[PDB]
Each structure stands twice: as C-alpha cells, then as structure tokens.
Amino acid sequence: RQDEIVKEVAVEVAQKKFELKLTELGPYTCEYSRNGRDLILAGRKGHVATMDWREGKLGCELQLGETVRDARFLHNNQFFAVAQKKYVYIYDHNGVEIHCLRKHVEVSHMEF
Amino acid sequence: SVQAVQVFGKKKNATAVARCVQGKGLIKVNGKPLKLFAPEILRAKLYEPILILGTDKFADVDIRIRVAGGGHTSQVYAVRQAIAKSIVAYYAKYVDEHSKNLLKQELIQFDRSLLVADPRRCEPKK
Amino acid sequence: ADEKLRRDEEEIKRMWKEISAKLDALSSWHYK
Amino acid sequence: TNFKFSNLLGTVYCRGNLLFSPDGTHLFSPVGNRVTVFNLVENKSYTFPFAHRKNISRIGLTPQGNLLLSIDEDGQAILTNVPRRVVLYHFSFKSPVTALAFSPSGRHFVVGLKRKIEVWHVPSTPDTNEDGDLEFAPFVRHHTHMQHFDDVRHLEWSSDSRFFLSASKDLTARIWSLDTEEGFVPTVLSGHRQGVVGAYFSKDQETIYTVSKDGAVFEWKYWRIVNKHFFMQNAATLRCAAYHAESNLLVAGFSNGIFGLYEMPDFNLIHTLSISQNEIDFVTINKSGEWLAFGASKLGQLLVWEWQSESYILKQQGHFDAMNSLVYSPDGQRIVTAADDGKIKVWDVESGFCIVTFTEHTSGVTACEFAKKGSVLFTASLDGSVRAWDLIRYRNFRTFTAPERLSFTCMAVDPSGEVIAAGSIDSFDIHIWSVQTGQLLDRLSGHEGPVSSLAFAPDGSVLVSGSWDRTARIWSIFSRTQTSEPLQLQSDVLDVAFRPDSKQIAISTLDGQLTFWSVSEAQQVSGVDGRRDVSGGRRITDRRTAANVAGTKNFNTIRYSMDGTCLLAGGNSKYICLYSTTTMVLLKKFTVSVNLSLSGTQEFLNSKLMTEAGPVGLLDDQGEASDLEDRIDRSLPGSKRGDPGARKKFPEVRVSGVAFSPTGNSFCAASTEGLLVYSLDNTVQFDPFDLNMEITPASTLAVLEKEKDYLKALVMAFRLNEAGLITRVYQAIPYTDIGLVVEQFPTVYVPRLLRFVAAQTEQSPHMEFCLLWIRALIDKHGPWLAANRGKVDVELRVVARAVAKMRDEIRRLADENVYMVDYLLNQ
Amino acid sequence: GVAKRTRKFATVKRIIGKQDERRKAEAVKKAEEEKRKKEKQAIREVPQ
Questions:
Q1: Torsion angle of C-alpha atoms A14, A15, A21, A22, degrees rounded to 10
Q2: Which of B64, D19, D594, E6 is 20 to 30 A from residue D217's alpha carbon, by CA?
Q3: What are its GO cellular component terms (chain B) (predicted)?
Q4: Strands B27-29, B61-68: parallel, antiparallel or unpaired by DSSP?
C-alpha cells in the first residue's frame, strides 16, 4: 500500500504523493510537460487549469465554458493548446488566448 | 432612515409636489395650512380626498405641498391630485399592501382624476 | 445562352431565400 | 370556480419511448411531463393525473396491461394504475434509466442503468392482494450486475420470461438468466462495428438477432454467428429497430427519416419509406404485429403504420415552436392554435388529434380568431398578412395585407364578420379591411405607439385599441361619426378583453395591473394590482432573484368567462391567475408546469446546481454527442423570436394564451410544454344547493319507488347534485309525466336542467326522451329564457349544441334513406 | 454550508489583443525606444 510506501520513502517525494478533489466539471484529462514541471488538467465540462504542481503554483485556471476534448503543453510549459468543442485554441502561460486554430475542426486527439 | 414619499400632481400647467412623511396630521400647502390655500369656493375640492378617505387615515402623516404655475383652478386640481397620490403612495411603501388597494378603490370609485391626470389633446375630426 | 441566364437567376433566388430567412432570424422577426 | 386538470392537448409526442396496449387499441405516448393515452380504435384521448419533474425518459407496461411504470430523467420513477387512472407508487432509481423491459410473465422487470443491470420484482398492488393496501418500500430487487462496459441501450426479454438479453452501447449484447440454469453460462455476443441498438429473440430461442448502429444485423446460432448481413444506406446510421418474433419481422428506423421493414428468417425487404426529414427516435410494434409506431423526437411526429395495407392509420405532429394564440369554435368542440412554426392547426377537444393543419403562412402566426359563426377562421401573421380561412371547405376566402409591407401582430374581427381590424408594431396605425368587398376600408389614427391588443365588442359597435402610447381607445366606427375616446392609462397596454355583455372591458397593463372600465360612459370601475400574484420566478440566466425580476410580473393575456364573473389572466410566468369582477378577489391560481427541464418553474432554484463555472445546466455540452447533426451548432447569435437555429435547451415557462371554453366547465392555457385544458371537476366533490336533514339517496329513491312524486324527486335529486341520482330519477320518470313536471317545476333550477339534458342528449342513447325534455322546457319556460337571454345564454347554447349535433348527424341519413328508397321504389 | 462565492457579471474571455509587447512589431518598438531616449534626454538642438 502507499501508506507503506509514503512511510518507508523519503519526505520530499512523500510530499509528491498528493491528491486533488474536483467533482463538479467532468472527467479530468491530465498531461505533464516534458520536464515534469507543470501539468494541465483539462476537464470535459470545460475546466482547464495549468499548474506547477510541486510548489503549488497555479499558473492558470481558465473556465472556458463549453466542452473540452484534450489539453497539452507545447515546446515549453509556456504555451499550451486545448482541443475545444469545435476548434483548437492555444494559450499563453497566463491563460490568455493567443489564437484560435480554425483549420482543425473537432479535433479529438493531439500530439506534439 | 425616515419614512419619506415624494409625489407629484398636474393640471394644465400647475404642477405640485407633495412630500408625505411620518407625522401628526398636518397638511401645509406652500407653508400655509391646507384650510387656507385656494380661495374659499374651491376648498371643498381640496378636502374631497380627506373626507373620502377619512381623517383617521391621515392622523399619522404630514403632507407638504409646493404648487407652481397655472391659475387658481389648476392649482386646486394639482393639490388634490398630490394629496390623493401622496397617501396612496405612503400606504404603498410603509403600511400594508391591502390598505393601498382599498384607498385606490375609494378614490377611483369617486373620480379617477384624483390619481391619473388626463390632459386634453385635440380632435382633428375625420 | 438563356439557359445560363435562367440557371443563374434560379440559383440567385435560392440564395436570396436562404439568406433572407437568416436575416429575419437575426432580427428576431422584426422585418417587413 | 373549481378547476382541476383535464387533458394535456396539442402535443402528440415529446422525447421518450412509446408503447401500445396489449389490446393494440391504446397508444401510450409520452409528452414532456406526462403520458397521454389515446384510444385509437374509438378515438378518445386522456392524460394521466401525474406529472414528472423532468421529461419522460421511458414507459413500461405489465402484460396484463394494468400497471404503467414511467421514468423521468435521472431515474425518477413512477408506477400508476391505468384502468382506474390513479397514481400509485413513487420510486427513484439513482442512475439515469437508459433501458427498461417489463417481463412477459408480469413478474419481473429488468432496468438497464447507465451501466448497471438490475432486475426487480414487480410490486403487488392493492388491486392484486386480497385485504391489502400500499406497502412502504414495495420494489424489492432480485439481482443487479454491472459486468458490462458502457451504456445499455436496449433490453429484450424471452417469451417464457426466463432469459433476457441486453443491447449495449459499447459494442456487444449479453444473454442472461434470472436463476442459475445447469448448462448455461452467461455470455457475450461479439463484435459489431459501432454498437447495438437491439438484440431480439425469435420464437424458437436458438438463433439470436442483433442490430447495430452502423446498419448491420447479425444472426447468431449455437455460440458463433450463422450469418452477418448488412444493408446499404447512404448517409444515415441505424438508430432504432423492433422485432416481432411471432410474425418474424424487423423494422428499423434511421437518421434520415426513413424506415425499412424486413421479413427475417432470411434477410428479405418487405418495404421501406421515409416519414420525416429528421431522425427516427423510437419504434414500438404491436402485439398482433399489424401496427408499427414511430416517434421522431425533433419535431412532434408520432405515427402508426399498417405494414401490409401500406397506410398511415396515424400521422400526427405538435408545434415545434412557441404558440401565439388559441381560440374555440362557438360550438366549443375544437380549439385552434397558431404558432411560430408557421402553421395554424385545428385540434379536436375530444380524441386528442389535430383535425386540420393549415400551412399557407410563412414565418410565424401571431393571432387567431373566429366570428360569431364558427365557419370562418380569421388569422394574422408576421408574413404581413391576415388570412381568412373557410373552415367548411378547408381553404381561404381572402388574404388581406397592407399597402406598405407590414407584419401584423394583432387581429380582431367584427362579430358579424364583415369588418377586419389588424395592427402591427412596424406601423402604429390600425388597418381595417372589409370582408364582403375585399379592399381596405380604413386605416385609423390616434396612437403614439404600436397598438398591441385589438378587440371588437361582442355587440359589434365598438372597436377597442390598446397601445404602447400607454393608452386605450374606444373606436366608434359604424355610425356616421367614426369617433375616438381615449383611456389614459399608466403603462404600456398588454391586453384587452371584453365582458361577454359589452358593458365593461378589462385591460392588462405592463405594471402587472388589470383594470376595469365602463364602455358606455367611459370610466374606470375597478382594478387589480396583480404584480405579486404573477411571479413565476428565476429562470436560469437570472442573476437577479425570483421576486425581483420585472418581466414575469405582468399579464400577457386576459379573458372573461362566459358568465362574465371570473377573469383569466396570464403572462410570461408560471401562474395562471383567476380573478373575479364584482368583488375583485383572486379566486384561484394554477401552477402551469411542475417540469424541471423547463426553466421558469422553481422560484428559489437550488445551489447544488451552481458549479464554479456557473449553472451546470448552462454549460454548452453539445460537443458531448456522438452524432454530427447533434454536434453542429447552426444557431444564430442572439435571436429571441423564431430562428431555425434553436439550441433550445431549457425553454422557459410562459402561457402564450388562455381562453375559456364556450360551453362551461373548461379552460385553456397555450403554454410552452403543450396546450393544457382545465376542467371544473365534478365527479368526486360533493356540493349540494339548498339541502335539508332528511334528503338522502334513500329518500330520493324512496319517493321514486314507494310514493311516486316525480317533481319532489326531481328537485330533491337536483338538490343533492349527484349525477347517479339525477340519472336515476331522470331515467325513472315517464315521458307522459314530463309535461306535468315541467308544467309545474321551479324556475330557479331550470338552467341546471338544461345543461343536464343537453349532456344527456349529446351522450346518452335516449333521443326522443331528451328531446321531449327540451321540448317541454322551452315550451313552458319560453318567456323566461327569451326575457333573460344573457343570464342563460350559455345554457341555451349547450342545448343548441345538442339539438344540432342531432339535427345534422342522423337526419342527413334519414333524408337520404327516405328519398333513396322513394327512388328505388319508384324504379 | 456557507453562502457561496458570487460570480462576476460582464466576464469576457482573455484574448491576446492589440497593443501588447509580444504582438507588437520590433521596428515600432525601436521607434518607442527612440522616442523615449529623445524624450528623457531633453535637448533643443539648435546648430550654431
């Protein structure tokens, strides 16, 4: 059990065994960066959030309304892309919409 | 935090304000009391809302009326409209809602010109 | 040819029924 | 006075599974809240007493067709008693119910939840057990198993009710028991392409059929597959399928409105045709195998189809947009209603069907009216036109319009229907045409705003205009002085209604207040401030509270009753508001909708809904859909009145128009979720007239059988006001003694007797008896009826209804028979 | 339990918009640097 692992294993990573309770807005897609320093959790009812999970630094939590198919970071943890109900929008680190991608319609899966 | 009601009244050009607050029975029209305004032969038309509604409805309020414009007759109709709307409006906002509807019924069963002023346009006949 | 003129005219009437219906729907039926 | 809920009317179908009776002659059709049965071999409809909280998801029936289990969304269950139309058990499945199959042995039912398969014992009812009542928690559960992987679309039992079988949403079907068999292991029917919409048994339970969503239908034997066979279809996917195992036939309804019909021991097309432009939602199939029933869920579109005599026994549809007006014929037997769909259609009060649908307007029909006559249906629309329909020939006389293009929103025809008034929002003059000429007689002046309610007097001497110049107007046309007489009001006039004697008129104005005016000497006589009486509070997208929204606090439409005593009043709200005229008191108030997939129902809407995005019923989840035309949002941004786009989730609660029935005891609300009729319920509630201590049914029947005094027994049974006793003494006195009783009968029970013998003429098989009653009553009570003529004007017209549905229904036949036999006997 | 946190009213999506830094052109940005250096360095150039 992870009570046995969290006890028998060092305290800096015993910090890293955490949980996070978000009931109301759908099943939560998650994706890290490729250094592991940030994660998006997308929520299919709309709720998309970018965070630094170790230091608890919530870089963004955008609400976004309509449904969400997939979220993913780009080359850094500085831009991310989310596949919406109809288009795929990409966003800056502050969660500000830099641009809507119109040529990709009802994208269901993404890979960078 | 006082119980204050502002109310207007109209005729041809005479416009009258009346402020009705929580008082002790007085009605003063341009400073002078109500039984002194509007030369003698029309004070019955001043009193018409009072002795429709009964003075027991008025023994808890104070009505302060400023009247401007018009002639004597139009100032009388502006005053009595401001009286009637003043008490209906005070009983709208401060005492219960049933008593408003009862006062509107008494005034409307007498004459609707105590509440709604109907100014005359003209008739260009066909 | 008159077949081209009348084919163009019928396609333009189809376009105006579709577009004019969408305009009255945007105005929420406050048209003439 | 005392109005309960009669039939919902004007929608044949909404979302939901529909079902036949086991006799085959009753169709169980879900409307939004409720379930309407309509008797189909003898057309007569009825709605049940209950009303769910959400839209009906499903209905199941016991094989002895006496017990009906309905499901609203999120599993909110009911089961009611259909022979005695009473509501019996409440229940709640906790998941939403996506499949439901009641056992053919009347013993179990399997429900398929969002993945769960729970088989339940059916509760024994007080009609079943000997000295038994309602239990507390009557549903006991036999099994539950969640060994599936996705949703369960369909459930189909065996014939002997020992196996049942589940059509997935993943890809598969599964065959399951009720108790452990000795050579059976519960097993899985393998891969389709998309996911099975059905999986049906035969009679011989060896081959199992299974019908997917991508067209393919497989036959399995013992456990591999004996022959998979598809069928082509161009741009559509298979969305419903029903299989009659006795007659070996499979219907299959699709996404493009077409259904195919296939005899299947081997794949063999009987037939196919298209019924809608939209998808086919639900297929049920008769116990005989002769009638097929198809529900298309987007429009109304309920239809029943004879598959061998290829013919529509039923093809009915509601309104797919908001209604705008209803009226009644002066007979009182049919209500007509217009909508923003573009059609004006004519509904029969009995039998629950539309008898006509007129489609010659475009773009939404505002108003709708009759004359005195009931022959001609004058209607008005935003097309710009007032169409004057001929209702005996089902086609229009004359479509009037204005010289400059308008869009009329209000309409009033003279009672002697030779003068038309209409009025618009674009112009703010009022246009009057002449019917017996065809031209435009005048356009009339006076208003400083768009005239928003027009009404002629039932005398027909006075037109009355109510306009957004906060004013009303008496238009005295017909004499040599076409004069006006304004009524300076306080706010924007919403409505105008006449007292049926033309001496008094009521206006709704935008405050929420009604007021009452003399017409001869124009002078306000009375008035209601009804702002608090009408507040059906807190739609979603209200960040304001329920009692602060100005916008549900005004009456759109008002009517008087046929006596002239009570008013109906109703607005963009939840409460219909029934006032009086003499004492001005609110008599009664009705909650239109209990629904919760409507919007304006709950004032004090609960905070469990409000997620950290907003209301959870406001998140656009259209991308959570597996079909392309469901996913595509082809709406226009910011359209209030009719658009083809129509996302249309959570419509609000309005009444779009009330009107009283011309015969007594009924009531119409043109609301959003149908067309509700309320009726003065009289068969449960005891209500005497002037009654003493001795007067029992033993006393009425005592002076009926022991010492026969027919006048005292008749006034005695009236004086109880019990229908069984007045029927007993009515069919007890003889047709010689009728003229004795009526020749000496009290004058103040006469219109009760006229209404009773009118109902007995129209309903009981006693022609010359009841016509002798009417003959005696009008012969003796002639000067009284002619002298009063307004006090009794409804009683004389329910009688004239009865003696003209007798004069035209059987004496056309008597004339045609006597002159036909006169010819064939002349040779 | 507790009266919940009130939503705002006129909320719009955060879009990048005109007159930023990272959208704005580099030569326009050098024009802004020239105008600032010539605005701070207050010099009325009168050649002799």
A1: -130
A2: D19
A3: cytosolic small ribosomal subunit
A4: parallel
Q: Strand pairing partners for D401?
A: D385
d(C-alpha D45, C-alpha D348), whole Å:
10
Tell me which residue has tokens 């071999």.
D41
Cα–Cα distance list, A69 to A30, A86, A88, D203, D630 (Å)? 11, 9, 9, 45, 16
Give the tokens for residue D295: 């529900």
- Interface touch D613/A47, C-beta < 8 Å: yes
Give, for D797, the enclosing helix (H) or strand (E).
helix D795-802
Cβ atoms within 10 Å of D431's Cβ, excluding its own? 23
Contacts of D523 in chain B (CB under 8 A): 112
Is A25 in contact with D622 (Cβ distance < 8 A)?
A: no
Of B112, B119, B125, the CB nearest to D524: B112
B126 is in an annotated binding site: no
Q: In what order do the strands lie in the sheet with D86-92?
A: D56-61, D67-72, D76-81, D86-92
CB contacts of A63 in chain D (<8 Å) are: 612-613
The angle subtended at Cα A100 by Cα A95 and Cα A104, nearest 5°, is 125
Q: Which of D243, D247, D287, D245 is nearest to D25 (CA)?
A: D287
Distance CA D288, CA D20 (A): 11
CA distance D197 to D215: 10
Residue D583's φ and ψ, nearest 5 degrees, are -105, -5
Q: How far apart are CA B8 and CA D19, in angstroms?
A: 66
Is residue A21 within 8 Å of A40, Cβ to Cβ? no
Q: What is the SS3 assignment for B90?
A: helix
Question: What's the distance, Cα to Cα, between the start and end of chain E in Å?
Answer: 81
Fill in the amino acid letter for D403.
P
Collapsed DSSP state (helix, strand, coil) of residue D351: coil
CB atoms within 10 A of CB D509: 23
Helix (H, G, I), strand (E, B) or coil at A14: helix
D chain contacts of residue B120, beta-carbon cutoff 8 Å: none
Q: What is the rounded distance in angstroms from the CA atom of residue A28 to the CA atom of residue A45?
A: 9
Classify burial at D51, counting beta carbons within 10 Å of its beta carbon; exposed 0-12, middle 13-18, buried 19 or more: buried
3-class SS of residue B60: coil
| DSSP class of E30 | H
How far apart CA D347 and CA D345 sit, in angstroms, is 6
Measured distance CA(D721)–CA(D43) in Å, rounded? 30
3-class DSSP string for C1-32:
CHHHHHHHHHHHHHHHHHHHHHHHHHCCCCCC
Task: Give the three-state DSSP class for D490.
Answer: coil
Cβ under 8 Å to E: D residues 521-580 = 543
Could you tell me which chain E residue has the CA closest to the CA of D543?
A: E9
State the residue for tokens 């077949």: C3
Q: Where are the beta strands (DSSP E) in D94-192?
A: 99-102, 108-112, 117-121, 141-145, 152-157, 164-168, 173-176, 187-189
**What whole-number distance in Å separates Cα of residue D528 and Cα of residue D586?**
9
| Both tokens assigned to D553 | 């606090």
Cα A100 from chain centroid (whole Å): 18
Contact assessment for residue B90 and residue B20, using Cβ atoms and an 8 Å cutoff = yes
Distance of residue C21 Cα from the nearest chain D Cα, in angstroms: 9
The single-letter DSSP state of residue B112 is: G
Nearest CA among D791, D789, D568 for reference residue D666:
D568
Touch B-A: 3+ C-beta pairs under 8 A: no
Would the CA dihedral through D215, D221, D223, D227 be positive or negative?
negative
Shortest CA gap D525–chain B (Å): 6
> Across the interface, do A95 and E14 touch by the CB < 8 Å criterion?
yes
Q: Which two tokens stand for residue D109?
A: 């039912």
The reply to whether residue D488 touches residue B104, judged by beta carbons under 8 angstroms, is: no
